[PDB]
């Protein structure tokens, strides 16, 4: 019905600095930096306040389908702040009912080599997206920790790893085997 104004405010901590040359948002924090182009949203972004620096997102004369993106923008900024402050760590555990899945890292966790998945001789090589590092965690059996900054990259690499081990021509209910993302959290705690 062409709503007049739709505004959403996002708070910013003291650790991270955020900047905008336009719809482009750049967040600089303790662990690396993030930058995203929002040229396909068509929404106003303005930071205001000293020592607080709250970011408001404003939409004027938007329909029911256009008023939805003003919250997705704030959610993306929240995810960027969370990843640049604490980071995103996905623990993926592998179910290996009979055949043990042998996962190894190739080059600084940028490449995952999976051997002996359901007894197949095929070697599955999955490369991680830039900025995501994977490792075999200790004090636990058959798990992989994938740590990074950008959530849309960490979860993308996790989904790639999960879909690499997929049963074919067999039952999906039966033959429960493969690496599934068990836990999702941050690298830094107490926040």
């Amino acid at each position: 019905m062409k709503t007049i104004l739709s505004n959403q405010t996002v708070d910013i901590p003291e650790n991270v600095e955020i900047t905008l040359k336009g719809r482009t948002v750049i967040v600089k924090g303790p662990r690396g930096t993030l930058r995203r182009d929002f040229n396909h949203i068509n929404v106003e972004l303005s930071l205001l306040g000293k020592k607080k620096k709250r970011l408001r997102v404003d939409k004027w004369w938007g329909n029911r389908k256009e008023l939805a993106t003003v919250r997705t923008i704030c959610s993306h900024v929240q995810n960027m702040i969370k990843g640049v402050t604490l980071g995103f760590r996905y623990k993926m555990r592998s179910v290996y009912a009979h055949f043990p899945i042998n996962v190894v890292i190739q080059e600084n966790g940028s490449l995952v080599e999976i051997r002996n998945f359901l007894g197949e001789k095929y070697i599955r090589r999955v490369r991680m997206r830039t900025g995501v590092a994977c490792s075999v965690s200790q004090a636990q059996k058959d798990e992989l920790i994938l740590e990074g900054n950008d959530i849309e990259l960490v979860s993308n690499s996790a989904a790639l790893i999960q879909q690499a081990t997929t049963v074919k021509n067999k039952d999906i209910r039966k033959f429960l085997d493969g690496i599934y993302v068990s836990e999702k959290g941050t690298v830094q705690q107490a926040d």
């Binding site: 062409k2 007049i4 106003e44 303005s46 004027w60 004369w61």
Partner: protein, 139 residues
């Protein structure tokens, strides 16, 4: 971003229409496509004009919403919009366009003759400034 807003007390310029070339005061917004405009001191009556018909300016006046003419003209005179309107780079460009359109044949001839004297000296000085910059950047 978005340093101009329509509101109760915004003076706007009419780009086209029956009252083209005059300033009005937006009293209130009606149906997100047209707004009531007063323009008491600009010789225009109170009526509804579309948003796309008007062009926003920088000056803002303090009116209560849906105010009368005796209360909007007083604030117009208090803000003193008319005299300060000529002291801007926008009304000056508009008047410049009007004068260029009102040019006559003698005026065009005089302008053409003055261009010969004006542009040539500028060109001969640019030819010296360029060589001066070249000699400066030579070492």
């Amino acid at each position: 971003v978005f340093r101009r807003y329509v509101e109760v007390g915004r003076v706007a310029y009419i780009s086209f229409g029956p009252h083209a070339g005059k300033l009005v005061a937006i009293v209130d917004v009606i149906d997100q496509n047209r707004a009531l405009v007063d323009g008491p001191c600009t010789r225009v009556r109170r009526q509804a004009m579309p948003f796309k018909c008007m062009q926003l300016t920088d000056f803002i006046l303090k009116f209560p919403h849906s105010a009368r003419q005796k209360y909007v003209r007083k604030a117009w005179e208090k803000a003193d919009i008319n005299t300060k309107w000529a002291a801007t780079r926008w009304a000056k460009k508009i008047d410049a366009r009007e004068r260029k359109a009102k040019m006559t044949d003698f005026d065009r001839f005089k302008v053409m003759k003055a261009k010969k004297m004006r542009n040539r000296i500028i060109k001969t000085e640019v030819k010296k400034l360029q060589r001066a910059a070249i000699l400066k950047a030579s070492p």
